[PDB]
Design a protein around this ligand. Sequence first.
Ligand SMILES: O=C(O)Cc1csc(Nc2ccc(F)cc2)n1
Ligand SMILES: O=C(O)Cc1csc(Nc2ccc(F)cc2)n1
Ligand SMILES: [Zn+2]
Length: 356
Amino acid sequence: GASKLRAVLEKLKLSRDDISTAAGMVKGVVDHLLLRLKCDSAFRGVGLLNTGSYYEHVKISAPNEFDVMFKLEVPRIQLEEYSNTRAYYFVKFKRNPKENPLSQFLEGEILSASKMLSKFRKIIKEEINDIKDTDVIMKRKRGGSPAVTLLISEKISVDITLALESKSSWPASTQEGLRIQNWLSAKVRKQLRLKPFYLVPKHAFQEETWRLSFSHIEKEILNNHGKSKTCCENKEEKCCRKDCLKLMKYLLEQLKERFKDKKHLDKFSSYHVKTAFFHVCTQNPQDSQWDRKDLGLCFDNCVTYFLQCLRTEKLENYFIPEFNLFSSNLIDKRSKEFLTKQIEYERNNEFPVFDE
Ligand SMILES: O=C(O)Cc1csc(Nc2ccc(F)cc2)n1
Ligand SMILES: O=C(O)Cc1csc(Nc2ccc(F)cc2)n1
Ligand SMILES: [Zn+2]
């Protein structure tokens, strides 16, 4: 029963001190990079974005892998959507009132992600080989985001993403997103959409496009997650929302590990499970629908909705509802069918993947 789930959560806590030590290694190298980056013309306004739920600027994505986002204030943003994709954009600047720090990165009117990315890499790689006395090595993956993957003395991998910050109103494609009004309130949705949004270098084939990112809002709604403002602040108001997301992420990690002989699940990520989880929070807005005592039922709610998304081949980005993370363009039909069969078996047999 749910004792099996509570036992899984207890076992995960046993790794708590290890990944808090590794993150202490990440925080030291990232801070070292930020000081170098700020000395550069284009990057003087570079900073650490708040994306982690346990360490302020260091996000845990999976065992021993960390995500970090470097934000750069960029005024006078002008967005042009790339070919109805809803999430990808060309970046232009509001017509010249003197020249911007990023002038070096233009191609005609468009801000070149590859130009900007190349200088980001160079400055960081300088601080990998200028201080070759430290155990860090740098891999470069395909997509522009993550831009740089540092390996710290091996076993500790950290992805570093550059993110443009825009303080402008969110783009039209987000107008019907962030459907939190019945859960976190209209007042909160208004406040959240007054915050900046972010753009990361990413291509859709390849162009000089940027993709929207809302990692800071995601962190804020996960940490301040109750209909009650005092959810999880006292013994009378303990919900299981965070634990359900933890278990869903762990479920997917464990299945991918077991299906490593063929790797049919490599296109699925913790972002898919987190997005599905936010939809289930919208579906079940009351804290009484997440009572600690109901961990088993609540996890079943989360899994059942994830299964529905797989079977219908539809998982809307929580901020951009017309952006389908499960479209056949992104994940082929056979992979979604394959994951459906495995999750369906696990749900129908009380999750034996969690057995000891
Ligand atoms: O048996 C209980 O304690 C109550 C209950 C109701 S539904 C449910 N689901 C459930 C899901 C996964 C699991 F590994 C174990 C249980 N648990
Ligand atoms: O969101 C992340 O940082 C990681 C991740 C994994 S899959 C994915 N797709 C995605 C697509 C459009 C979008 F606007 C936001 C996200 N993003
Ligand atoms: Zn809570």
